[PDB]
Amino acid sequence: DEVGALVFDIGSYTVRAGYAGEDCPKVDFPTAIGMVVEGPTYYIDTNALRVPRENMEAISPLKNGMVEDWDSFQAILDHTYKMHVKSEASLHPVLMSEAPWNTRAKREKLTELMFEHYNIPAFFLCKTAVLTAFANGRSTGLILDSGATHTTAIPVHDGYVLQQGIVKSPLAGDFITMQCRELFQEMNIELVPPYMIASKEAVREGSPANWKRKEKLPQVTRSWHNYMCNCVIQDFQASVLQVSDSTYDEQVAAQMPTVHYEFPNGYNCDFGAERLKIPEGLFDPSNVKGLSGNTMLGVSHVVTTSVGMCDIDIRPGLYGSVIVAGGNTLIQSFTDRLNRELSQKTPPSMRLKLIANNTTVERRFSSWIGGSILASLGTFQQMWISKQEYEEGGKQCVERKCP
Amino acid sequence: KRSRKESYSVYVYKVLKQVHPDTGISSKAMGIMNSFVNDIFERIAGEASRLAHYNKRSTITSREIQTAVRLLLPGELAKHAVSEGTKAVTKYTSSK
Amino acid sequence: KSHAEIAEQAKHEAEIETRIAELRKEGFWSLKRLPKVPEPPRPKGHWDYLCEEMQWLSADFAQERRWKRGVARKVVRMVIRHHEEQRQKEERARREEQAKLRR
Amino acid sequence: KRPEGMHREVYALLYSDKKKVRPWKWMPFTNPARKDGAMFFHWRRAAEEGKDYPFARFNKTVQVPVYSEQEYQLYLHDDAWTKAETDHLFDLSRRFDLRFVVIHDRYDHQQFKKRSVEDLKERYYHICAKLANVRAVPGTDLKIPVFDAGHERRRKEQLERLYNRTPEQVAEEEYLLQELRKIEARKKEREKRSQDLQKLITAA
Amino acid sequence: RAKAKSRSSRAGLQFPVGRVHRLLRKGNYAERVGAGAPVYLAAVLEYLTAEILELAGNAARDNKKTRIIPRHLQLAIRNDEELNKLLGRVTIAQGGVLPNIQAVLLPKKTESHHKA
Ligand SMILES: Nc1ncnc2c1ncn2[C@@H]1O[C@H](COP(=O)(O)OP(=O)(O)OP(=O)(O)O)[C@@H](O)[C@H]1O
Fold this sequence. Notes:
The longest helix of chain A is centred in the middle third of the chain and has 19 residues, at about 220-240. Chain A has helices at about 45-50, 70-85, 105-115, 130-135, 175-185, 220-240, 250-255, 275, 280-285, 300-310, 315-320, 335-345, 360-365, 365-375, 385-395, 400; strands at about 5-10, 15-20, 25-30, 35, 40-45, 55-60, 60-65, 65, 95-100, 120-125, 140-145, 150-155, 160, 165-170, 195-200, 210-215, 260, 270, 320-325, 385. Chain A has about 400 residues and is an alpha+beta fold. Chain A is globular, with a radius of gyration of 22 Å. In chain A, strand 4 and strand 5 form a beta hairpin. The longest helix of chain B has 28 residues, at about 25-55. Chain B is globular and about 45 Å long. In chain D, about 45% of the residues lie in helices and about 5% in strands. Chain D has helices at about 10-15, 70-75, 85-95, 100-105, 115-135, 150-160, 175-204; strands at about 25-30, 40-45. Chains in contact: A-C, A-D, B-D, B-E, C-D, C-E. At the A-C interface, helix 14 of A face helix 2 of C. Strand 1 (about 25) of chain B pairs parallel with strand 1 (about 65-70) of chain E. The structure holds adenosine-5'-triphosphate. Chain A: InterPro entries: Actin, Actin_CS, ATPase_NBD. Chain A: It is found in: Nucleus. Chain A: One of its GO terms (cellular component) is nuclear matrix. Chain A: This is Actin-like protein 6A.
């Protein structure tokens, strides 16, 4: 059942690669790898990417959870294979995750790219929602994945995704980063990434930062500077932001304790109601500046819409198995707000139940853990796409063995 | 705000199923079995306490319980309980 | 009572009328709810075997993660105990000098 | 002298009341459940190098029937369904273990017109029943209990009506719930009691 | 820490040695209960319960029933020589005494042909 394999979870934010059967991925690095057109050189290591040099324009090999640069994809695959894996691809089957909305053309091109270039013994392309359901202990249920690019509610019934029930919303990590940018700009906060700081001195709360700029600066692009700024913004998110328990109330938002945070340049200040007004857009995009439009569906709205487009015979099961995953889901009180909104919306007959997985490893790596336990099953041995299957049936075999 | 009450229904149904896989037990029969368990518990405990007190001892030990079982259970019923208890103590101290 | 009972009784007739109105609205009792479902199950189902093995292995993986974290906690607390007991053993070597005097 | 020599408690209770040579190796193996002969590897023992793969038994495929072109053209002809429209249904059934809740989604709506779940299932079961009725010797469950698609349709519709009930059909619906008992008690306790009391007054 | 093992599992008993020792230590039966007293008590309780349950199941199977009832417990307790000696003072709710057979009526007297 357990054979030496490599489960690849290529997320839009981070790519997780490891051996099937492990509790955690072997490596986890940001997906927005820096690129320099020298062929082009790519850096697939946190210590080799977030470095004060080497312009490294961020190419983001994938976008919207789908492959968009096959050359950069080959480069990142090669680096992951001989940097942390350090093994011949021909000796290990490959189980790779895919976005449910991934087109067949991509699927097939990726499949053939792993048989004529890497010559892997077997292949399999499973959807992220299926893997998530597989990990959390449910074959039927709704997968709520609030990633960096999009927040999606993917209904899984009997291990298969119901495309008609897929609902997507652009309110994701990118939206949170944009809101944090706007908040910093409104509070006259200079977002100085670490690579620009030579040294700093402790200053009083709210006072201007006293930091020295490095004289021998790197030759960075606007893209790489924005990438460093977005990393700092994501740190700020993980450190400060918190979802409101109930619908955002300005009066109640001003009664919550503040959270202290110091930027890399030394600037530090306490945040009050501004840290709880940003995460409200995820659930209620109406009260969002610059987002003038009601078509955007909130997390609870996305869930209810995804469940509504499915057959009523399975909606009870979907509500009874609503798996929450993604990095954005790690924000404080997000789960409580989501459960409250769903209980208020979910009809009484439908027994709402939220799986109690909330750990960072359990959340961000749910998709990878799913494939890890799926490739370790003896029953899964009969579903592999063997090299002979690809050589005979061609690239289109991906559509039959792993629909 | 719950007022939970305990019982041996968990170790008696288990014993029943291990000795009688196919035969069940009703709720009232379970209560009667629990009452018997508690009554024998009280009897053995009181006998061991009194036996220890006779010897000017402030501790009830396995020997006191063994002699109390010898005294209470009649004829060819004590021996079996004593043997079971001794074999459980020997298997308990052996760290198995 | 037993006088001017119309004020109380006409309410029941109004409630009957509202009951008919609601039956027209969505329905009081859904007509013929789940009368027949003859779909015969598969002999076993490959997917049902896969789901059984999936449950078996997922429960195992979860328990194994929990047990691994518990064992890590155990070993860390054990090394902390080793250091604390080394210092307590220095103190007890002093107490053993005292006990040797005593002996 | 006391023999003892054993544990204190057990002793008192008893007396007071008188080379491995099995190497694991990385072995290749072929799974009988596969027809392509794909060679996989497994961590097996040395005592069973060459034994068949045990999990192959968990490969019972669904019993989707297969029929010839002539049989189709003769018996399974349908004005509303063409071969290109019918073969895809059975292909999806064979591919997804004959579950219609997933087959509907997989339906290629580009080349094929939109079909519900109930009508797809009805067409499938009708094709199966015809294949059985045109077969005598193989005993293909001639009397298949084909479900009534119309009853299934109205059931799907009434329960869907019972689904969306937010404004007043779930909260104010408690009124109709209480009425379910009031009308079953008040109506009787009024009219039948009126009859009974009239008969009593007649006897009185 | 190490995986905690209960005391019922070590000895190999089903009844709770833990709860037994608990009732004992704060039951005022003594000042400092021994470590082996509760194990032995639970073992004897388990043996007696197993015996009475065996007898009750036998009586139920003889009566063609699946669920044990006070009838079966009473029958088992009063049939066994030693359990009755142990539970002579005890009375059971919804129980009954051992019955007599009515077949004796047939070959002595029955309804005659008079106006039958
Ligand atoms: N500790 C944290 N606290 C709060 N938010 C976080 C934390 N860590 C990451 N995030 C947010 O989560 C986002 C990353 O999402 P994640 O990587 O889980 O999606 P994903 O699994 O890659 O989705 P997909 O598989 O569809 O690509 C980031 O944009 C970041 O803002």
